[PDB]
Design an enzyme around this catalytic site. Sequence first.
Site, PDB file in Angstrom:
ATOM      1  N   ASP A  35       6.744 -29.138 -17.987  1.00  0.00           N
ATOM      2  CA  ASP A  35       6.340 -27.743 -17.773  1.00  0.00           C
ATOM      3  C   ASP A  35       5.270 -27.674 -16.712  1.00  0.00           C
ATOM      4  OD1 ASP A  35       5.714 -25.137 -17.957  1.00  0.00           O
ATOM      5  OD2 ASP A  35       4.735 -25.253 -19.929  1.00  0.00           O
ATOM      6  N   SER A 199       5.516 -16.502  -1.628  1.00  0.00           N
ATOM      7  CA  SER A 199       6.801 -16.374  -0.934  1.00  0.00           C
ATOM      8  C   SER A 199       6.701 -15.340   0.186  1.00  0.00           C
ATOM      9  CB  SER A 199       7.895 -15.984  -1.953  1.00  0.00           C
ATOM     10  OG  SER A 199       9.103 -15.680  -1.356  1.00  0.00           O
TER      11      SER A 199
END
EC number: 3.4.23.22
Length: 330
Positions: A35, A199
């Site tokens: 994770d 992004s």
Amino acid sequence: STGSATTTPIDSLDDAYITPVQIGTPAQTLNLDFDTGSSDLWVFSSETTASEVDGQTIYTPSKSTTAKLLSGATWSISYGDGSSSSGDVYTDTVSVGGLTVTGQAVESAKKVSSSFTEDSTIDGLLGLAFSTLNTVSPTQQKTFFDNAKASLDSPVFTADLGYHAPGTYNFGFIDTTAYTGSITYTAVSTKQGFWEWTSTGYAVGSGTFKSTSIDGIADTGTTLLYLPATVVSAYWAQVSGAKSSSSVGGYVFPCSATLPSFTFGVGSARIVIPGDYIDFGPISTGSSSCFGGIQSSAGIGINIFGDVALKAAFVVFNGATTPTLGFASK
Ligand code: NA
């Protein structure tokens, strides 16, 4: 040193991925959920409340000649999905894919929430976010990656998740055979303890690319792609009969649909998520309503590039002094 381990989807939907991990001496192999959005290595154990264990493999520290109680240390964690676990701490030898760390904090669960009990395939979590998020008190502990780092050939790990197929986590090296083209690296903020990046924008299907900054985290422990409501609405508007359902808890679409791809930007590069990756199947067994793999992040307080996005790429988690992320097509 290096390590290389295969990671395998737990079910037919790629809800999560499990990776075998050797703990203790002689080795006890547990299948852990790696994770990148958390920083605790915790396991089902001989200490876990018996009614909260249903099929998981447990770690038994009393059977490990290298286990030592980390006296006084406790831990307690809450995840973004509402699940939780807590317990006490041992140090022990932990190996992943042939890479060994001695003295790793192995957090032994005394209690786990229902979602953990109900998932017999996941024997615990191995956190790979920054050690600043580790929950052990009163002495915070390091992740497996942070403890391995100095021994690694390169201070990196890579995630290569499969679509309905196994993939790979590598530690200490880049496998130049595992991706196509070049890797585009992008800056990381560690301010919140995550692999947080920005992004450069998105496109829906064959549509034009929208240049827009989207801050989010690279999180292997989250199934879906959670993005701002504007972006998500723009995606699902291209699917006839898709809608957001408050009763189901997100966007659903007719199971008869063909889904468009979703592209996200990494600098000037582009990662394309095929439409098929965004189909999470019937909302309930036999339903003709299917659950979407792109969902709104509104109310979660962060955008999350979970497995839907990451499995479309070869992802480099660069833990050098200035951390960065890299993405390549594959
Ligand atoms: Na679900």
